[PDB]
Curated annotation (Swiss-Prot):
Protein name: Lysozyme C
Gene behind this protein: LYZ
Role played: Lysozymes have primarily a bacteriolytic function; those in tissues and body fluids are associated with the monocyte-macrophage system and enhance the activity of immunoagents.
Keyword line: Amyloid, Amyloidosis, Antimicrobial, Bacteriolytic enzyme, Disease variant, Disulfide bond, Glycosidase, Hydrolase, Secreted, Signal
Organism (species): Homo sapiens
Disulphide connectivity of cysteines: 6-128, 30-116, 65-81, 77-95
Top-level taxon of origin: Eukaryota
Length: 130
């Protein structure tokens, strides 16, 4: 499913993402936008290390979810990577919450550093009523 901007903003707030571990809703929106373009079925294979990024937040199989084919990987979210390809984003959100509970926080995604960090991210939530 490809979410519309404000539709996603409202869904994320209801799932308790606003201010989670100090991360504002607009930051989560900026992350989803640059990671998948708000697309829940997005997958990206990394030929370099044999891992795959899954879903709206593009969560990596090396540490967060199990897909069976990634070498010496972990599954911190205790989920099949398939769970991160559903239209219902509850599982993806629960896993994203787990990722930021680590010391790096939102910095775990290099895309956030490149496209969101130190920028005016207000635009991602403007007019959405959140």
């Amino acid at each position: 499913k490809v979410f519309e901007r404000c539709e996603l903003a409202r869904t994320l707030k209801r799932l308790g993402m606003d201010g989670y571990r100090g991360i504002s809703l607009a930051n989560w929106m900026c992350l989803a936008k640059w990671e998948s373009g708000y697309n829940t079925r997005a997958t990206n294979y990394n030929a370099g290390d044999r891992s795959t990024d899954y879903g709206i937040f593009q969560i990596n199989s090396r540490y967060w979810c199990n897909d069976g084919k990634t070498p010496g990987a972990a599954n911190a979210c205790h989920l099949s990577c398939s769970a991160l390809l559903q239209d219902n984003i509850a599982d993806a959100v629960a896993c994203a919450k787990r990722v930021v509970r680590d010391p790096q926080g939102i910095r775990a995604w290099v895309a956030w550093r490149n496209r969101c960090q130190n920028r005016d991210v207000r635009q991602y939530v403007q007019g959405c009523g959140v």
